[PDB]
């Protein structure tokens, strides 16, 4: 099977600047009439993939001039000469030359901005939740940049790892920031045995700390 390896995996760029995405095949994708059926697709998170480039280097209907495709042999390149907000999303290469037709793994085109520290908010378990016998402590780390941030939980002054689940938003279309939710789930009994609950955001040193006492 033709393996399509896409680099980089993520590509921050300042709007108005150039972006380059590469796709390499594990074997030839030339067909017998001498043509190569390498396509590029753009997907946004609320969208289906849309065809942008076909046969290595051709813009599809309505694709503007800033998109260009090149390549030879086994290495292929999608270039965007002046990246616009509407261009951000996940790009995939694809070869339709040999069954099974295969896709590259995707490249997330993201926009740059100024660094921003997170706004951190901590919330205790609700009365409702304690009635089911569970206790989740929730920490939001909102509107930061860049996307890399670490959350650390402490219970009565000491690190807690177990029971933590994290989730991140896609990059915010309007302000180019990221947000993260971190949830520490305990039993009601384990929660009732301790007093101080703290969420700490680093990198970013030193941390942004939010706490409450049960």
């Amino acid at each position: 099977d033709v393996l399509m390896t896409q680099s980089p995996l993520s590509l921050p760029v300042s709007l108005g600047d150039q972006a380059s995405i590469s796709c390499r095949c594990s074997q030839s994708i030339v067909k017998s009439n001498g043509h190569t059926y390498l396509e590029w697709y753009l997907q946004k998170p609320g969208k289906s993939p849309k065809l942008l480039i076909y046969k290595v280097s051709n813009r599809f209907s309505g694709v503007p001039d800033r998109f260009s495709g090149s390549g030879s042999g086994t290495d292929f390149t999608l270039r965007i000469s002046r990246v616009e907000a509407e261009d951000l999303g996940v790009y995939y290469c694809f070869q339709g030359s040999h069954i099974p037709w295969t896709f590259g793994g995707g490249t997330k085109l993201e926009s740059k901005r100024a660094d921003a520290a997170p706004t951190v908010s901590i919330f205790p378990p609700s009365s409702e939740q304690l009635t089911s016998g569970g206790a989740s402590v929730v920490c939001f780390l909102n509107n930061f940049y860049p996307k890399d941030i670490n959350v650390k939980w402490k219970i009565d002054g000491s690190e807690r790892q177990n029971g933590v689940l994290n989730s991140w938003t896609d990059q915010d279309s309007k302000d180019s920031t990221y947000s993260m939710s971190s949830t520490l789930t305990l039993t009601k009994d384990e929660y009732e045995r301790h007093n101080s609950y703290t969420c700490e955001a680093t990198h970013k040193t030193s941390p942004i700390v939010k706490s409450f006492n049960r």
């Binding site: 896709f103 706004t119 609700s126 929730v138 989730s167």
Partner: protein, 219 residues
């Protein structure tokens, strides 16, 4: 105008069977080859089946050979995918996509239909309010949330004040817990707005025919 509409998706116990439909309009369906392409939860795209306009040619990758059967009924402008002996690996968003037989691979894709292979049972969410209390103390903006826990399958929709509160909202991707999903949503309003005007999250889970409203009250 040229349009593909998938239907038929759902949730199946592993080993189970399921049939997807793709309804074509705005073009002579008979002249076009068609494929199904799925997108995994991790967002990889995987071509899964092809059929020629005349049905004389079909093909599949090895991962689905014997279990999926692609077919079409040109007279009803429909493409189908019969899925059998479903595996956990088949969980994905399934798109139908056009490719002319008479160049432009997949110039038109449908919106997708979701298939979930699992013995997890349809379970309604618990919805818990996220309010401050003591802590600090106070500022110009206040952040509130709702913790939507223990539901299956995806998705859940979350709004605030029935959709009139739309700015300053973050609703986070759900994560798997113990065979169940959890998500949270945050909303940030002016401190002069809450607790004096109401803030309420509205959570819907179509799969369990449930809607839950939770007013955020101060502790």
């Amino acid at each position: 105008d040229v349009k593909l509409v998938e239907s038929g998706g759902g949730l199946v116990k592993p080993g189970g069977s399921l049939r997807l439909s793709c309804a074509a309009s705005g073009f002579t369906f008979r002249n076009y080859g068609m494929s199904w392409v799925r997108q995994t939860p991790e967002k990889r795209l995987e071509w899964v089946a092809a059929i020629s306009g005349n049905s004389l040619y079909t093909s599949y990758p090895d991962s689905v050979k014997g279990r999926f059967t692609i077919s079409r009924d040109n007279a009803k402008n429909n493409l189908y995918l019969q899925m059998s002996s479903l595996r956990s690996e088949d969980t994905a968003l399934y798109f139908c996509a056009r490719h002319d037989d008479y160049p432009y691979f997949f110039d038109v894709w449908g919106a997708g239909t979701t298939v979930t292979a699992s013995s997890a049972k349809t379970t309604p969410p618990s919805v818990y309010p996220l309010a401050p209390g003591s802590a600090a103390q106070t500022n110009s903006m206040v952040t509130l949330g709702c913790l939507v826990k223990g539901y299956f399958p995806e998705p859940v929709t979350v709004t605030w004040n029935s959709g009139s509160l739309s700015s300053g909202v973050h609703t986070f991707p759900a994560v798997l817990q113990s065979d169940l999903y959890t998500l949270s949503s945050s909303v940030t309003v002016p401190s002069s707005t809450w607790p004096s005007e109401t803030v309420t999250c509205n959570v819907a889970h179509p799969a369990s025919s449930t809607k839950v409203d939770k007013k955020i009250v101060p502790r």
